[PDB]
Amino acid sequence: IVEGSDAEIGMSPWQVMLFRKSPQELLCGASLISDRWVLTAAHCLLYPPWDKNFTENDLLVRIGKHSRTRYERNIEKISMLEKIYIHPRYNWRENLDRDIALMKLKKPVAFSDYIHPVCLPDRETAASLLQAGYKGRVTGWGNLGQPSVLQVVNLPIVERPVCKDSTRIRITDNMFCAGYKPDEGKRGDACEGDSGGPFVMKSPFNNRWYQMGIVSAGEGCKYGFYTHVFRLKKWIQKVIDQFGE
Amino acid sequence: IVEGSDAEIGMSPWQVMLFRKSPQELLCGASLISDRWVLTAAHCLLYPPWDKNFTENDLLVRIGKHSRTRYERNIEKISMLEKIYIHPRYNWRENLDRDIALMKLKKPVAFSDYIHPVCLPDRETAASLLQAGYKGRVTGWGNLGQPSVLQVVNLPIVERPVCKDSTRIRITDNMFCAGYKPDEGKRGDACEGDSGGPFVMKSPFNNRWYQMGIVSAGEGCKYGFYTHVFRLKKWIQKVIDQFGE
Amino acid sequence: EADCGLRPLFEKKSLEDKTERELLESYIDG
Amino acid sequence: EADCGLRPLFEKKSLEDKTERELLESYIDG
Ligand SMILES: *[C@@H]1O[C@H](CO)[C@@H](O)[C@H](O)[C@H]1NC(C)=O
Ligand SMILES: *[C@@H]1O[C@H](CO)[C@@H](O)[C@H](O)[C@H]1NC(C)=O
Ligand SMILES: [Zn+2]
Ligand SMILES: [Zn+2]
């Protein structure tokens, strides 16, 4: 997270540090939605070009953490994954169409002031807060340059016509984009390593935090893309309802 | 369960043997709906006349059992209760109006071919299968006379006008009743000790088993009453959504 | 929750208990 | 699930983080 700033404690408790088994190395990001359901980006797990064939054994996750380096004892939570699930029609080939994934956990996970999940958006919530001129918050650990604690930057959602012209890739509608125009002088964008992490918005209605997207490709280190979670909700609920036992 | 018969294995896997701590004694029945949510009758827990002030510490439950006496090892499951919740407007005084309760479990519980929950009924499901001339299945361990295994009897739902005339108590609409008319010669009714246990119906639509009621007062050892689960669903969902972490 | 009320030894096994038919005998509209 | 997206150190504590206001500055119809 570039030109970010330090989160205070329990400001995104649905944050999850997706942290590969051997060797000992931070991977992407991820997000907690149920007490066994982590939401992340597929190119974390699946992406032929960088040898990426990540299976359920091979990674753990770390839930309810501030610092990247250290270990909080009895504060944070070490979790294995009982199953991964990449999206069926997921297009690594072209434009990361449907860059989205789910990872069931081994055991369930108890909640605390530091661990807690995020709400997934409903109808009103997603065609109300997604907008021209509105911001959400992308939280993440990737480069500066390295941050001893979890970062948190707030970025503004770039108009459909504008992402399109600015980038070379064909954006589908199962993504949106965000990042500051060079116009102002607020620089700020998800760096690479912050992939899979939650774009969040605080509903003015119920005061609830909602994941609208997932860092698909931040770049930072132009506008960062995100998979348009809401426009792939129908998928999530098929996977959760059917497995998840 | 009188004039019953033996269940085969995993025929009601949402059955739960509500089994008091000291001394070692079967209590009512109960039913599994979520992986931390047991559904039972309040007069199991709360009923001034028979000294009944049962608190969360004082009882465990036993999930995924056939035999009453014995112990199936690695088959069944020993569970404590992290919290009870009697219904707020529950009337022990008069006619057991709203005889219904919920018991959160200590830890969560893994599912098996022998443990599994039951579906709670929706709109169609409850004004479609509740009826004049329709039966469900009340499963239970109480007297014969004692049954070395879990019993299972199927009884028919007695018309509104008929329960009323036959009994002395004012039946509310937050109950219905079932048991055979003396007319036929099929005797059969929930005995006392089978309280709190599930009245179930197999939906002809989705082939799904639904709890419509809870043995409120079987008597057996006249028509057995049941709390009209559906007409108190709204309550369940308030309790589950709000606590249950 | 969502896979509920389907006994793993029966409706997932495509089997039927001794007396579940009995129930279905007593429904069906007209 | 149902108590989601309410951080126990903030929205249950009736508090607000440094920059959550910032977000709310950028909405509201007209
Ligand atoms: C990943 O590897 C597995 C077996 O090691 C294989 O079945 C699969 O085809 C590979 N997947 C991709 C997307 O290359
Ligand atoms: C049960 O006992 C507790 C304390 O031992 C008391 O607060 C409560 O009033 C009693 N409840 C009933 C229903 O008698
Ligand atoms: Zn199952
Ligand atoms: Zn909570």
Residue numbers in the entry:
A (entry chain B), B (entry chain B): 16 to 36, 36A, 37 to 60, 60A, 60B, 60C, 60D, 60E, ...
C (entry chain A), D (entry chain A): 1C, 1B, 1A, 1 to 14, 14A, 14B, 14C, 14D, ...
Could you give the paper's own sentences about this structure?
A good measure of this aperture is the Cα-Cα distance between the highly conserved residues G193 in the oxyanion hole and G216 in the 215–217 segment that features a bimodal distribution with peaks at 8.3 Å for structures in the E* form and 12.2 Å for structures in the E form. Support to the conclusion that the W215A substitution retains the E*-E equilibrium but in a perturbed fashion that stabilizes the E* form comes from the X-ray crystal structure of the mutant. Although the structure could only be solved at low resolution, it reveals a collapsed conformation of the 215–217 segment with the Cα-Cα distance between G193 in the oxyanion hole and G216 in the adjacent 215–217 segment that shrinks to 8.5 Å. Interestingly, the perturbed environment of the active site and stabilization of a conformation similar to E* is not linked to disruption of the oxyanion hole. The backbone N atoms of G193 and S195 point in the same direction to organize a pocket for stabilization of the developing partial charge in the transition state during catalysis. Removal of the side chain of W215 does not equalize the environment of the active site between E* and E, which would have generated a linear dependence of α2 on ligand concentration. We conclude that the role of residue W215 is to keep the active site open and to slow down the E → E* conversion by establishing an interaction with the benzene ring of F227. Disruption of this important hydrophobic interaction accelerates closure of the active site to the E* form and results in reduced catalytic activity.
Trypsin-like proteases utilize a catalytic triad for activity, composed of the highly conserved residues H57, D102 and S195. Binding of a ligand to the active site requires the 215–217 segment to assume an “open” configuration and is precluded in the “closed” one when side chains and backbone shift to occlude access to the primary specificity pocket. A pre-existing equilibrium between E and E* forms controls activity in the protease and defines a key property of the fold as it transitions from zymogen to mature enzyme. We hypothesize that three critical residues decorating access to the active site control the E*-E equilibrium of thrombin.
